[model samples]
Target chain A: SGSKISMALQSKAVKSISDADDEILLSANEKRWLDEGNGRVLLFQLSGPMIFGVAKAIAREHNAIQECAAIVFDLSDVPHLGVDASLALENAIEEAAEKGRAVYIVGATGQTKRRLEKLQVFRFVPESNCYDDRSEALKDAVLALG
Target chain B: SGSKISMALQSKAVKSISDADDEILLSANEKRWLDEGNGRVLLFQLSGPMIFGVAKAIAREHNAIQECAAIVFDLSDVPHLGVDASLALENAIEEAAEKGRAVYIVGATGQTKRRLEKLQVFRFVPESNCYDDRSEALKDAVLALG
Candidate 1:
């Protein structure tokens, strides 16, 4: 047969990918914290303003992002979201949607919410998947999962 | 370059797989709760007694099982485990180890612990992975993840 994959290789992969980036930016930072619930759903909690750099950092998780069954974006603490950053995150969200990943939005308020609107995120993600509360977002994400 | 995958199909995948087995087991089944924590790590928390049927049900999650970075088996609530069932789970654990999935065991006490030893689990799994507490197991599993 087939070869089985290992979970241990991921940390090494993540570190290696980011380490080479020091050559790109001297000053940088969502310190995005990825957490999974209900065995399959991946929750990406982001804080602070999401500018280009932070958005790019989060995007670096493309492979990890694709592995999970679904995704939940928590932007409750993010008061501002740059247009380019919004575009980046939105594209990732779009990719997840097309692939059958149930993408959810949580805690996005005011400016951040408006930024998403500018990107017409509603065109793809169901309004039902959008949540005002973190618990509700998680609750529904788990419920909808396989 | 190829087609993206969908998370929505997983529920369909899981249901379709088991729905056909009525001919095999008219009287069965871990009610295994598959939960993911810290993104890539999958925590398969099993409860009740594990017999052949339940263990087989757990094993059916092979495709999903391979998706995570690490695994933590919480068998604390399980007061007993069948020999056949243990064989099934141990085989899955063995495969995970070969693939580099950092597998951890928790809550296995007394007889359950003894049973694992009989199978020579210690040979494949590290002593450090056998944790006495749930929180500690989780903390360590997260730390070791990518």
Candidate 2:
């Protein structure tokens, strides 16, 4: 009976590893993959004009990450957001929602967060999805996927 | 002695009227013309998707109102604004400043006021120009012209 229980736990652990093995790095700037054996998070370090380029890449990756359970966007490094950048982010958020993916945003604070709100980004993303810390956001993402 | 003083005031009033006589209404929704003898107040009643159109009219009328001493935007009925509208307003304010025309905004409150502030509309227009009532804004407009 002890051997059977241990075998069951090992099988469960193996399945978890297999689930997380399907990792696809979008790019160096924008990394998207599963984390900690369950949740999928996209760590994007964007600043200035990079938002435009990152948004384009996000659009391209939308089709590829259709099976992703819970997606978190790490926006801690992003500082400035002008009109074009806001519009691009809006489009990316809208696209993610259209695909029926649960989205989360982290590190959107200060002027960056205010500009996003001013751009009416809440239309696409809920206020709850935004967070000031990456670890909390990741935990939420994992819980959501679970 | 009284006759000379009254005549002087009358001549001054006439000159002010002559200066403000160039009333060119840019559009039906966005009316840009002189007001209260010497004040050049633009009474714009905007709602829905009229921002872009009104902003365009504002840009078109900027050149026409160059000679006016003080410019006031009566936004009493305007309730909402999108990004494009905000950008357009910013551009118009910049253009007016470039031409050395003093700009004033009136009746921007609640959601409209918040949206304007989020877009940093106060960067071009000072806090004094933003008023709750057209009368007060017009008073300042007249005073600035004075």
Candidate 3:
């Protein structure tokens, strides 16, 4: 019962990859996973397109990650990622690393993953840090804690 | 309080105008506007991009429009319209026309309107029937009943 919280929101994306972005929609969640005596993993289960506003919204509430042993960014349901969002996401990953925290990007495939690769954002992340499967990413992220 | 109901829905748009279309979002309403003896107009204040699935869903529940003096299809918040959706929308307009129902198209400006114009879907609709202003459209739609 300790693991909790889900929020639904929207951001008016004056411009973006979808017509929906003009009046964008969003949903997010926070789950406590891979708990250990030292620190627990925080999994952000987010859905829909990740534009600049979406990435910023996610980042704005990232203060909780400070206490997590590792972080799992689950975007399994997201289809598109714009340039600004990709950069912002990379910044989050970079920031986490600088603070001596582990960041795992899970569920970014198809066009979403291509954006990250094309933008060279993933260069900051080791190949092993990115994942297509949530379960696998969770397993690996938790293992890094030990 | 005779008018009651709003639904938030989604359809997996296999492919379409924007990346968000791949995982579409939808919201719909059955607004009772313009009252009189002949019939009250039904305003479908729909939001987001309309693809084949979105179009079909709207038409599927069109049985209510039978007794309306007129119908207003508002897409003011819509930014994109795809091929299948355009045709489906045309079919809906055609159906209403054939039944002697006054149909109005409102809020389909910018790219969304261009798609309709390019696809020749609005050929059956007079220029006055398509509007950029919701207030003006409502004014004319009600006048048609009298």
Instruction: Provide backbone clash counts, one per model.
Output: 5, 0, 0
lDDT of 2 by residue, A1-146 (tens): 00000000011110000001111112222111112101111111111111112223335433334455555554564555445545655665677678675667767766667777887677767879787754565456555553
Candidate 3 per-residue C-alpha lDDT over B8-100 given as tens digits, one digit per residue, 9 for 90 to 100: 111111111222211222221101111110111111111222222323434543442345555556666555565555666677678777877
| Worst lDDT 10-window in candidate 2 chain A | A1-10
Q: Please give, for every candidate in the order listed, the TM-score of chain B alone compared with the true chain B.
A: 0.56, 0.53, 0.54
TM-score of each: 0.33, 0.29, 0.32
Report how far off residue A32 is in candidate 1 (Å): 30
Candidate 3: lDDT of B66? Answer: 43
Report DockQ per prediction, comma-separated: 0.02, 0.01, 0.02
Question: Which ranges of candidate 1 are over 4 A from the true structure?
Answer: A1-63, B1-146
Interface RMSD of each: 23.3, 34.4, 24.5
lDDT of 3 by residue, A1-146 (tens): 01111111111111112223112121211001111101111111112222223233345434423455565565555556555555666666677778776666766677767876876665567778777765555556544566
Residues B11-108, candidate 2: write the lDDT tens digits.
11110000011111123221211111011111111111111222243354334334554555545545555455455556757877786767777676
Clashing pairs in 3: none
Minimum summed lDDT over a 10-residue window in model 1 chain B is located at B23-32
